[PDB]
């Protein structure tokens, strides 16, 4: 959680009920400005996985990038001639889904004239997934490390990185865009995880033109996929729905529990898929092999959802998502040039925008 400094000046406070009423209907599908990278095909044998046909989770080490907006060389180039607001899908999803968030987060905004850059701070846990964040009683750091919030987060994050690569068909020729991955040399591209980037543009009215990096994890025989893993750590301690007993006949109830307890995580995943234009959101259901060990996991189920329809199922309204973003953009455009910080208050349902000194970070 970022340390609020005494020389930070509050510009605006926004409570969740106000944010929840915001709307900007009519925003079009993103327009591709540049597409990059090479993505692997999904292995449809994983469609046969179920509780009676579980598969061990494999450890597959590939490199993942989560480059912030201003360090992205494609965004730097595009900003010379295109748009006036810049971000990435992960940063946008955090803002757009803020009214679902509980745990703290922050985003830095730099304003130069009529251009805005939204970034994450360097060396933070911004990328980590949360676990049971929106439970009535979230996990507490009361005990050893096995089920602490921090360890649960790293466990979920690790599970997701492995799952997304395991379900790929490594021998199938990849789908390659004309431009390669911008975060690695061609000579070494073999070592990066399967990913395709779409740098997309949106008209948000009032002359606001957003450019942001979006991505897909895989392709399917061409359909583009966003691949994510739900995970079960200890169902009893989580007071959850035991997956090995309930996935066969009550898969919907299991998902419903996930939605209640991981509301922000699931919405941010859905926004990521919608921003990229993925045709499907592919979920794995991954559980510990034993509740007492967080290093070994099994895949119990797989499912796919069309992102537009799934958004409606989790009560995510993109008209509201864009409305929230537009509200924040408008506030920033009215400020003096310089740096600003938006943050979610760790103990209250509100976000605050601060005027921070330019050399703060
Ligand atoms: Cl998350
Ligand atoms: Cl304002």
> Are residues 356 and 336 in contact, defined by beta-carbon separation less than 8 angstroms?
no
> Are residues 290 and 296 in contact, defined by beta-carbon separation less than 8 angstroms?
yes
**Can you tell me the distance from the alpha carbon of 275 to that of 95, in angstroms, rounded to the nearest whole number?**
13
**Can you tell me the distance from the alpha carbon of 208 to that of 213, in angstroms, rounded to the nearest whole number?**
17
Residue 330 alpha carbon to ligand 2 centre in Å: 6
22: tokens are: 């915001």
> Are residues 87 and 81 in contact, defined by beta-carbon separation less than 8 angstroms?
no
Residue 109 alpha carbon to ligand 2 centre in Å: 15
**Can you tell me the distance from the alpha carbon of 42 to that of 196, in angstroms, rounded to the nearest whole number?**
14
- At residue 167, φ and ψ (nearest 5 deg) are -80, 15
> 3-class SS at 355?
strand
> Are residues 275 and 212 in contact, defined by beta-carbon separation less than 8 angstroms?
yes
Q: Which ligand minimizes its atom distance to the CA of 90? A: 1
Nearest residue to 215 (alpha-carbon basis) of 74, 115, 99? 74
**CA–CA–CA angle 86, 353, 198 (5° rounding):** 20
**Can you tell me the distance from the alpha carbon of 212 to that of 271, in angstroms, rounded to the nearest whole number?**
13
Residue 155 alpha carbon to ligand 1 centre in Å: 12
> Are residues 315 and 339 in contact, defined by beta-carbon separation less than 8 angstroms?
no
Residue 307 alpha carbon to ligand 1 centre in Å: 17
Q: Which ligand minimizes its atom distance to the CA of 328? A: 2
> Parallel, antiparallel, or unpaired for β 223-232 and 280-290?
parallel
Residue 337 alpha carbon to ligand 1 centre in Å: 31
> Are residues 277 and 30 in contact, defined by beta-carbon separation less than 8 angstroms?
yes
- At residue 104, φ and ψ (nearest 5 deg) are -65, 150
Q: Which ligand minimizes its atom distance to the CA of 353? A: 2
> 3-class SS at 151?
helix
145: tokens are: 């490390």
Q: Which ligand minimizes its atom distance to the CA of 336? A: 2
Residue 115 alpha carbon to ligand 2 centre in Å: 16
Residues near 293 by beta carbon (within 8 Å), at least 6 away in sequence: none
**Can you tell me the distance from the alpha carbon of 128 to that of 154, in angstroms, rounded to the nearest whole number?**
7
Longest Cα–Cα distance in the chain: 61
Residue 31 alpha carbon to ligand 1 centre in Å: 26
61: tokens are: 């080490």
> Are residues 235 and 241 in contact, defined by beta-carbon separation less than 8 angstroms?
yes
What's the Rg (C-alpha) of the chain?
Answer: 20
Residue 264 alpha carbon to ligand 1 centre in Å: 6
To what resolution in angstroms was this structure determined?
1.4
282: tokens are: 């592919």
Those residues whose beta carbon sits under 5 angstroms from the ion ligand 2 are: 331, 334
**Can you tell me the distance from the alpha carbon of 129 to that of 150, in angstroms, rounded to the nearest whole number?**
10
Q: Which ligand minimizes its atom distance to the CA of 330? A: 2
Side-by-side strand order, sheet with 280-290: 55-56, 293-305, 280-290, 223-232, 218-220
Q: Which ligand minimizes its atom distance to the CA of 327? A: 2
**Can you tell me the distance from the alpha carbon of 242 to that of 249, in angstroms, rounded to the nearest whole number?**
12
Helix and strand numbers, DSSP H then E, in the chain: 8, 15
Those residues whose beta carbon sits under 5 angstroms from the ion ligand 1 are: 129-130, 265
Q: State the DSSP string of 91-140.
A: HHHHHHTGGG--S-EEEEEEEETTEEEEEPPSSSSTTPPPSSTTSSS---
Nearest residue to 231 (alpha-carbon basis) of 311, 165, 291? 291
Residue 277 alpha carbon to ligand 2 centre in Å: 31
Residue 218 alpha carbon to ligand 2 centre in Å: 41
Residue 113 alpha carbon to ligand 1 centre in Å: 33
Question: What is the C-alpha end-to-end distance of the chain, expressed in Å?
Answer: 14
Nearest residue to 321 (alpha-carbon basis) of 10, 17, 21? 21
> Are residues 353 and 11 in contact, defined by beta-carbon separation less than 8 angstroms?
yes
The label of the residue with tokens 């703290």 reads: 104
Residue 265 alpha carbon to ligand 1 centre in Å: 4
65: tokens are: 């990038």
How many whole angstroms from its chain centre is CA 232? 19
Q: State the DSSP string of 263-323.
A: HHHHHHHHHHHHHHT-SEEEEEEEEEEETTEEEEEEEEEEEEE-HHHHHHHTT--HHHHHH
């Amino acid at each position: 959680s970022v340390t609020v400094r005494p020389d930070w000046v509050t510009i605006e406070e926004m409570d969740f009920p106000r944010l929840s009423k915001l709307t900007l209907p009519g925003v079009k599908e993103g327009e591709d400005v540049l597409c990059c990278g090479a993505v692997e095909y999904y292995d449809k044998s994983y469609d046969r996985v179920n509780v009676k046909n579980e598969k061990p989770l494999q450890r597959i080490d590939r490199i993942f990038h989560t480059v912030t907006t201003t360090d992205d060389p494609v965004i730097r180039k595009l900003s010379k001639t295109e748009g006036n607001v810049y971000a990435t899908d992960a940063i946008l999803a955090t803002i757009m889904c803020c009214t679902r968030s509980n745990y703290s987060w922050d985003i830095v905004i730099e304003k130069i004239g009529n251009k805005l850059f939204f970034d994450k701070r360097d060396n933070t846990e911004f990328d980590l997934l949360t676990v049971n964040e929106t439970s009535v009683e979230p996990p507490q750091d009361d005990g050893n490390s096995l089920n602490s919030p921090r360890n649960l987060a790293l466990e979920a994050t690790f599970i997701n990185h492995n799952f997304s690569q395991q379900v790929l068909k490594s021998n199938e020729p990849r789908y390659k865009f004309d431009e390669p991955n911008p975060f690695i040399s061609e000579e070494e591209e073999g070592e990066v995880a399967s990913v395709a980037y779409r740098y997309r543009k949106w008209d948000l009215n009032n002359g606001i033109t957003l450019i942001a990096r979006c991505e897909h994890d895989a392709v399917m025989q061409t359909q583009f996929l966003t691949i994510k893993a739900l995970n079960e750590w200890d169902s009893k301690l989580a007071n959850g729905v035991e997956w090995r007993r309930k996935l066969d006949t009550q898969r919907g109830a299991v998902l419903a529990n996930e939605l209640r307890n991981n509301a922000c995580k699931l919405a941010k995943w859905t926004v990521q898929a919608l921003l990229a234009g993925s045709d499907q959101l592919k979920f794995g259901y991954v559980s510990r092999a034993s509740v007492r060990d967080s290093s070994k996991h099994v895949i119990l189920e797989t499912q796919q959802y069309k992102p537009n329809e799934f958004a409606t199922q989790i009560n995510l309204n993109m008209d509201n998502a864009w409305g929230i973003l537009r509200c924040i953009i408008d506030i920033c455009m009215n400020q003096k040039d310089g740096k600003y910080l938006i943050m979610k208050d760790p103990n209250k349902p509100m976000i605050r925008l601060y005027d921070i000194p330019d050399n703060t970070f």
